[model samples]
Target: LPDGGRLVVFPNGTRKELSADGQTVKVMFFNGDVKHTMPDQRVIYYYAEAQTTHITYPDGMEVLQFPNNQTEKHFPDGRKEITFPDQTVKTLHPDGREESVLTDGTIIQLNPDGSKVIQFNTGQREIHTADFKRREYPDGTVKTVYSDGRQETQYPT
Candidate 1:
């Protein structure tokens, strides 16, 4: 059967043939199982399925589906690197200005702006100095004189 001729063999007998391209290929299929042999008479691909989907890739390669909503990126070392929600786990600048932010406007760092300014959170009644010093007063009321000789009062909850 090397010249495209058809030959029938018994169940226990082996049959060899050549393809139109002069290459030998063997094909076998039964029920839901299928197998193919390459021209070199080596098994190229095979699959069997009952009620579930199955796929096989050769040469240790992988198959991937894209655009998955929950897909995440990882570090080269396989660590689950932060992508969103945590943009400031790493330090930004030496002045501690750039920092992480909460759902509210509460900042995680002492200062986000470049200045020696002091911040007083009226909601928390907490005072933060430009030198990274923090002090909490029982009441929210705190008076301070601005650089322009203007007095300001901050009230707490």
Candidate 2:
């Protein structure tokens, strides 16, 4: 979307455009010969159908619907889930790296080899974490280290 708007469409189909507010943006999709949008235009990400699109802010994150929503979420070189409806979640980094995908509610942590490293689901919540080494935690949070010397923590309950 150019000439009239600055819509950034990724190879996979996710679309993102800067809103007039300059602080927020609206994301919709061209699916099944029709365009579907999230109920609230205030969200960074919205849903179209089976494919989920995630937005990475400077310090926050948002997720849109899977599939019919946007094509950007489908990476050119990375793991992706197309079968499981609820598990089809895609995460992207600020640098445009395809981090991971959740299939049918199954958390699929993709490696450089495109294999699932971790998979889980908590109730109906969808969780996606970036590379642990790049995460920053808030002060006073409980910090923990793993046996392999890796570190991470929880900010709040």
Candidate 3:
């Protein structure tokens, strides 16, 4: 308890307490579930049985966590991000764009305008535009594909 507030723990392992100024409340259940409410009306829930936690912010950001170390964060701008246990991450934008980063440091991005970009850990990059596609290799080789089904390759000489 903060600021002279009292904490009551029942015989069944449940507990309840209030903040010192009585502006906050916290409760814990015997089954490992917990809940907290703040003065600003923000509520947090921890579901022990499901191994998940949910946090809601006042500014419209929501955060969710699962058992496998996976988490999703939602922003007010309609963008969402999911992070996995292996360090891979994915983000979805409000405009239907998507981006992802793999565990091996490769990045893949997709735009709503039908363009795409991929960057590999080996220092190679690939880009796809509406009219053509191009690839740049680490060894100074470049390849291009045109809309007319023509292809061109350039070497470093």
Candidate 4:
């Protein structure tokens, strides 16, 4: 025990401890389950059988790690990012946007609002509007849809 903290061992092989100032705490079970809290109010939970650790921060951030190398991070600002064991990453922003970049150089973006502009890696671009969705194809074709369900298509003849 440190920082004037006290340690107690139960007769059943369980343990419980707390810091002097009560800012930090820990609980251990006989089955190897562990739960700890830091001075900043961050919590750490460990699953011994699954070999996983879940850490939650005071600012509403969470970090999770599994035995298979998968990790996930969650932010207070409505943002989240997940990374698979293969190194693939998917991110979601607070502004209702999503983005992902694959290992094969493919990129994807999703926008919740109607007004958005997407520039592809292939030098192609698209513009979206709140009341209108327009697209121009490489073959000189134009398509537009309005919020009122009006559709228009123009082809290069």
For candidate 2, lDDT tens digit of each residue in 14-121?
576664444445554555122323334323443345344454333232323445334333334342323334345466443434444554454444454342344445
- Write the candidate numbers in order of decreasing lDDT: 3, 4, 2, 1
| Candidates 1 and 2 compared by lDDT, better number | 2
Of 1 and 2, the candidate ahead on TM-score is 1
- Report the lDDT tens digits of candidate 3 across residue range 30-98: 999989888987778999999999988899998999999999999988999999888789999989899
Whole-model lDDT per candidate: 0.40, 0.43, 0.91, 0.82
Candidates by TM-score, descending order:
3, 4, 1, 2
Error of 2 at 87 (Å): 6.9
Which candidate leads in TM-score? 3
Sliding window of 10 residues with minimal summed lDDT for model 3 = 1-10
What are the models' TM-scores? 0.22, 0.22, 0.79, 0.61
lDDT of model 2 at position 103: 49
* Tens-digit lDDT track of model 4 for 82-152: 88888878898988888766665555677877456555565455667878777777888878888899989
Q: For residue 56, give model 3's deviation from the true position in Å.
A: 1.3
Model 2: number of clashes? Answer: 21
lDDT of 1 by residue, 35-122 (tens): 4445544343333443322222333322211222122232333233222343323224443454434434454544545433322333
